[PDB]
Structure formats: structure tokens, C-alpha cells
Amino acid sequence: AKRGRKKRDRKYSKANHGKRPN
């Protein structure tokens, strides 16, 4: 369940603005 949590934390960067696909 680690790949889901790590891909979901990278939407909280400055360029993504809280949002990514998926």
C-alpha cells in the first residue's frame, strides 16, 4: 500500500496546487 501513499503525497507541491490526475 506504499506506492499509493507516495504517489498521492506528491500533489501537495507548489506547482501542482493540491491537485494531480488520479
The minimum distance between CB 19 and RNA, in angstroms, equals 3
9 neighbors 18 (Cβ within 8 angstroms): no
2 near RNA, judged by CB under 7 A: no
Q: Is 17 in the site for RNA (CB under 7 A)?
A: yes
Nearer residue to RNA within complex by CB, 2 or 22: 22
Q: Where are the beta strands (DSSP E) in the chain?
A: none
| 12 grid coordinates | 501537495
Interface ranges with RNA (CB under 7 A):
4, 7, 10, 13, 15-22
